[PDB]
């Protein structure tokens, strides 16, 4: 029974709170709960954007939800890889604090680009070829923003959410 299980899931979703904790971020055993909590906080932000749609970029809301859909789906399924969840959770954590928007944006830059030496890489930038250049070509060693277009879509939607949270917290 699809509607019965759906309503039960929408009900069970309310049994846990959205407040993230810095020690929970990175816990291997707590990973499913943190993943669900992240999904729920994203839905909270989306609900406030829905509540203010006619005042803040209505045309972008639909695309943002359609782009965040795969992320939310993977978070519900706990399928999101540990590194990506740790980064995302750090973003949402800073986003929940009283005035840490810049820390949220720094954590977002860590989520999108990260610590890789060559986020995108460069190929044969000059006429003097060397074996070492093969390393800096990127490819599989690229940043999270380069994994696939679906990942870029949801990651930049998270950035758009940070921008909305900044606007909202400042006006209200």
């Amino acid at each position: 029974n699809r509607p019965e299980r759906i309503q039960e899931a929408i009900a069970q979703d309310k049994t846990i709170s959205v407040i993230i904790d810095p020690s929970q971020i990175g816990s291997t055993e707590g990973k499913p709960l943190l993943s669900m909590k992240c999904n729920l906080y994203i839905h909270e932000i989306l609900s406030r954007w829905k509540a203010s749609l006619e005042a803040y970029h209505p045309e972008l809301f639909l695309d943002t939800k359609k782009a965040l859909f795969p992320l939310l789906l993977q978070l519900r399924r706990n399928q999101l890889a540990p590194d990506l969840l740790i980064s995302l959770a750090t973003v949402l954590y800073h986003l929940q604090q009283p005035k840490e928007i810049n820390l949220a944006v720094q954590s977002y830059m860590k989520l999108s680009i990260g610590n890789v030496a060559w986020p995108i890489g460069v190929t044969s930038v000059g006429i003097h070829a060397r074996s070492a250049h093969s390393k800096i070509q990127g490819g599989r060693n690229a940043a999270n923003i380069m994994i696939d277009e679906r990942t870029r879509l949801w990651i930049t939607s998270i950035k758009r959410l940070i921008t909305f949270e900044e606007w909202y917290t400042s006006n209200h």
């Binding site: 995108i120 990127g138 490819g139 599989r140 690229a142 380069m146 994994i147 696939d148 277009e149 870029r152």
Partner: peptide, 8 residues
């Protein structure tokens, strides 16, 4: 991997 250009 994937292309840098945005199709939309």
């Amino acid at each position: 991997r994937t292309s840098t250009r945005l199709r939309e």
